[PDB]
Amino acid sequence: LTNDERILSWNETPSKPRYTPPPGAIDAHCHVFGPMAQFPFSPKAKYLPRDAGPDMLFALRDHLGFARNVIVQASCHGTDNAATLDAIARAQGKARGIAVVDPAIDEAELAALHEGGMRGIRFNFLKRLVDDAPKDKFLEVAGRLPAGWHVVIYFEADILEELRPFMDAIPVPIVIDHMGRPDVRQGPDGADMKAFRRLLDSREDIWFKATCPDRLDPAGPPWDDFARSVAPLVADYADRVIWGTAWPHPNMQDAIPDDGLVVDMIPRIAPTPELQHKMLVTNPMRLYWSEEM
Ligand SMILES: O=C(O)/C=C(\C=C(/O)C(=O)O)C(=O)O
Structure with a gap:
């Protein structure tokens, strides 16, 4: 099923960010x-994307100024992590990963994923x-993971x-994707942000990605609703926030x-050198490269 027939979901000639990420x-x-x-893609896949391999990822990384x-x-x-694992290998030390596993995965397989650069697993609701x-x-499987x-x-x-009981029971730290998709139209003190802050206030080891204005802010760029709703969340939970492009x-x-x-949103949600350093360097290093910290 030929590449140009599958789904393109990225910009093939993205703009250069005005913002320069730190070293x-x-x-x-x-x-x-x-x-x-x-x-190959999983039989359970709900979308059939165009190829977006490691060389494309690293070209995008370099274009945007990430390390x-x-x-x-x-x-x-x-649950076939092979493509991700190959991408991590090809990054020559500049990548770590998150896996999706069969909940019955054996400890030997988990250890092998760790050796291949995985540092957690993802649950998609x-x-x-x-x-x-x-x-x-x-x-069950969340309690059988490799150390750290x-x-x-x-x-x-x-x-x-509905998920509060489940998340409270998870025996390891938690990272929330895209803040659990709050409706950023409501403002920083809107219903969804208040509910999300209740979650963050329940456990100290819940981290979040301050990500995806494209997904959450239907007005489109400059995504002012995302900026205004998310900046206070970043400022109030500065030691628990990380960031990503979500490319491709x-x-x-x-x-x-x-x-x-997408990258130019960073200095809007993290306006100070302090917040940029935490969100882009210190916090993700603590989660993904703890041995360097
Ligand atoms: O990748 C994301 O961050 C979000 C999406 C896709 C996935 O989570 C996935 O396919 O694993 C989405 O919302 O469609």
């Missing part, structure tokens, strides 16, 4: 897709992406309440973001 900056949420010929990446297993590859999300089995791993959790705001933007074909503009 050592980490794009802590990105993906590779395939290449399909070497790494390192956390390469997150994409749902189009299911979006039905449009993954049919099944067995909370019982997720809780965390879980990454992706959900929509309308199920945050799975499922964003209807509103393909310009990565230059």
Whole structure:
């Protein structure tokens, strides 16, 4: 199934960001897709993306001015982490990863994923992406992970309440993708942000990605609602926040973001050198390269 027939969801000639990330900056949420010929997609995949391999990822990384990446297993590859693992290997020390695993995965396989640069697993509660999300089995496997791993959790705001018991029971630290998709139109003190802050206030070891204005702010760039709603969250939880591009933007074909503009959101949500250093360097290093910290 030929590449130019599959779904393009990224800008092939992104603008240069006006903002220059600091030395050592980490794009802590990105993906590779395939290449399909070497790494086929999962039968459970709900989208069939165009190839977005390691060389494309590193070209994008370099174009935007990032030093390192956390390469997150994409749902189009299911529980086969091979493409992600190859991308991490090809990064020559400049990447770590997040895996998606069968909840029955054995400890030997988990150790091998660790050796291959994985530092956590992802639980995806979006039905449009993954049919099944067995909370019982997720809780089980979350307690069998290699030392120093965390879980990454992706959900929509309308199920945050229902997930509070599950997240409270998770025995390792938690990273929340895209803040659990709050409606940034509401403002920084709106309903979704208040609910999200209740979650953050329940456990000290819940971190979040301050990410994806393209996904959350339907007005489009400059995404003023995202900027105004998210900046206070970054400022109030400065030691618990990380950031990523979300390139190559799975499922964003209807509103393909310009990565230059995506990166230019950073100094809006993190206006000071202090917040930029924490969000882009210190915090993701603590989660993903703890041995260097
Ligand atoms: O990659 C993201 O950050 C978000 C999306 C896709 C996935 O989480 C995935 O396929 O693994 C989405 O919202 O469509």
